[PDB]
């Protein structure tokens, strides 16, 4: 769909993810290829298949984020499944087909909501005419001067201009309606009333299929958790089983959805792993084949942490500022405050368990616990979160390890 070049894709992705340039390009080549394919002939269009990617890296460094923004940037159906979710189906559990089903139910819960956007002006234009007709019951057979039913637009234009907030005036209109009512309702009862007329079925539901088939993006987290490890054998066949079960999906097959018949042959798959225990070559042969692209993501650094704190669009720091503004409170972060927020996050991760950029959300959130509660009783003030503030609030927590395993 999008005609963006890889370089433009990476650019657009830089607005949400710090670093991880290689993964960016990998995922960007993927999107541009979908375009590249549609520019081909009949034969070559069946042949060319998605270049599925295998992202390799430690927790919370941007694997999913990258894949999620990619999806979002191509208005494509997106689903994120955890691979081990099926390691248990040998005893019972979700069949792997559910993936394509869900990627469909959301590829629907998507086309539906985005049909309320396109049809949100129809009910408040060529449909608000409902109340105006019971306000000034049109002439006994309008005459016809292509400006005659626009003539009123005096008596008429008055009811429309006055209908800029003034309602609660009960009337009635028309299974159409008939029933007598108000306007905080005759009007809203009209909102949906006239709307379900434009949106049909065999196109809305038919297109979801179209989306999934053409632009679907499946993110399979922890793919490495279903590779073979040298501790046992019984669980290995179960693991390898999920690999075989997933095989039909990435090699090309047909799944049954209560919305139609989806074809996976062009769904883009982004698998994900850490690979500390297993190595990508532990994956079964058929899967490695279907996972042509390999890309690593680096661990994040304190500098990346500082950058993640403020650069991204709607970064947690920015969101926070916004939220406190709701309280009439002007919050401000100094470069050193942020430097210390990142610092703390890094400390805890190094001293306890490393959970990537995730740690920033909990640190930042604890740091603010106090302002967040008193926000309403501080309206009209300029609170500055500087290095001092940061230290007075997080030092004792970070310093105490056992405490951090609970509170941070």
């Amino acid at each position: 769909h999008s005609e963006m070049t890889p370089r433009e894709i990476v650019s657009e992705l830089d607005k949400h993810i710090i670093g991880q340039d290689n993964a960016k390009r990998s995922v960007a080549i993927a999107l541009r290829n979908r375009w590249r394919r549609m520019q081909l002939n009949e034969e070559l269009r069946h042949e060319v298949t998605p270049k599925n990617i295998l992202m390799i890296g430690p927790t919370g460094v941007g694997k999913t984020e990258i894949a999620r923004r990619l999806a979002k940037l191509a208005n494509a159906p997106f689903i994120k499944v955890e691979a081990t979710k099926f390691t248990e189906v040998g005893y019972v559990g979700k069949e792997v087909d559910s993936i394509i089903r869900d990627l469909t139910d959301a590829a629907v819960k998507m086309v539906r909501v985005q049909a309320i956007e396109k049809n949100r002006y129809r009910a408040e234009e060529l449909a608000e005419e409902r109340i105006l007709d019971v306000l000034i019951p049109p002439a006994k057979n309008n005459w016809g001067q292509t400006e005659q039913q626009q003539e009123p637009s005096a008596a008429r234009q008055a009811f429309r201009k006055k209908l800029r907030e003034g309602q609660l005036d009960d009337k009635e209109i028309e299974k159409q309606k008939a029933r007598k009512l108000k306007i905080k309702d005759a009007m809203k009862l009209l909102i949906e009333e006239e709307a379900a007329k434009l949106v049909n079925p065999e196109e809305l539901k038919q297109d979801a299929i179209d989306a999934v088939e053409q632009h679907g993006i499946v993110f399979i987290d922890e793919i490495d958790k279903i590779c073979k490890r040298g501790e046992s054998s019984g669980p290995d066949v179960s693991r390898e089983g999920v690999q075989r079960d997933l095989l039909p999906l990435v090699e090309g097959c047909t799944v049954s959805t209560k919305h139609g018949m989806v074809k996976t042959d062009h769904i883009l798959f982004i698998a994900s792993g850490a690979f500390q225990i297993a190595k990508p070559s532990d994956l079964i042969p058929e899967l490695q084949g279907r996972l042509p692209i390999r890309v690593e993501l680096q661990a994040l650094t304190t500098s990346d942490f500082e950058r993640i704190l403020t650069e991204p669009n709607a970064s947690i720091t920015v969101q926070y500022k916004a939220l406190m503004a709701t309280e009439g409170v002007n919050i401000e972060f100094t470069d050193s405050g942020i430097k210390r927020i990142a610092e703390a996050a890094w400390q805890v991760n190094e001293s306890t368990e490393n959970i990537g950029a995730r740690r920033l959300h909990t640190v930042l959130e604890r740091l603010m616990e106090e302002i967040s509660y008193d926000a309403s009783d501080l309206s009209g003030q300029n609170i500055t979160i500087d290095a001092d503030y940061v230290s007075k609030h997080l030092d004792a927590l970070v310093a105490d390890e056992d405490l951090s395993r609970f509170i941070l």
């Binding site: 006994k140 057979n141 309008n142 005459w143 016809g144 001067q145």
Partner: protein, 174 residues
């Protein structure tokens, strides 16, 4: 009754008397037999029930709304239903209708008629008016309004069913 319509020098009229008769006596003496239609653009006169009118003159109006002022056509569509629609069929009358374009008669038979010179004379006194109208129109410079008037008076003088109460409706255009 006598309905007289004339047209001369970018001026069209329709005139009528106001006598309604029951047997050999006068029921009413001031019946308005010439109204106006289509946002006072189209004039009309008629012979029949006060209601038949009000139903045939309302319908006509809408037909004009369905044919952008184009008289004739609306008239064509009117005379149409008027001889087709089960109900509308019982209505009896003679609509005289004239706009800046043309002027014509309509009969329950569905006929749409454009007389020789937009000269119309329907009703029992019809021909006496036609005669006087034709005379004046061919031997004097009098105005369309003056014509219909005098023609009408002549009529009411000859016609036992026509009186001297008038109702004139003009129209200028050039």
């Amino acid at each position: 009754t006598t309905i007289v319509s004339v047209r001369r020098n970018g001026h069209v009229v329709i005139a009528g008397d106001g006598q309604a008769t029951l047997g050999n006596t006068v029921m009413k003496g001031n019946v308005k037999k010439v109204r106006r239609l289509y946002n006072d653009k189209v004039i009309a006169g008629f012979a029949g029930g006060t209601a038949d009118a009000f139903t045939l003159f309302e319908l006509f109006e809408r037909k004009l709304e369905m044919h952008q002022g184009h008289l004739v056509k609306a008239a064509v569509e009117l005379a149409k239903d008027w001889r087709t629609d089960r109900m509308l069929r019982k209505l009896e009358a003679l609509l005289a209708v004239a706009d800046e374009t043309a002027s014509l008669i309509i009969t329950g038979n569905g006929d749409v008629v454009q007389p020789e010179n937009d000269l119309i004379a329907i009703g029992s006194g019809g021909p006496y008016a036609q005669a006087a109208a034709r005379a004046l129109l061919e031997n004097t410079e009098l105005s369309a309004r003056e014509i219909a008037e005098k023609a009408l008076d002549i009529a009411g003088d000859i016609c036992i069913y026509t009186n001297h109460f008038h109702t004139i409706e003009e129209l200028s255009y050039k």
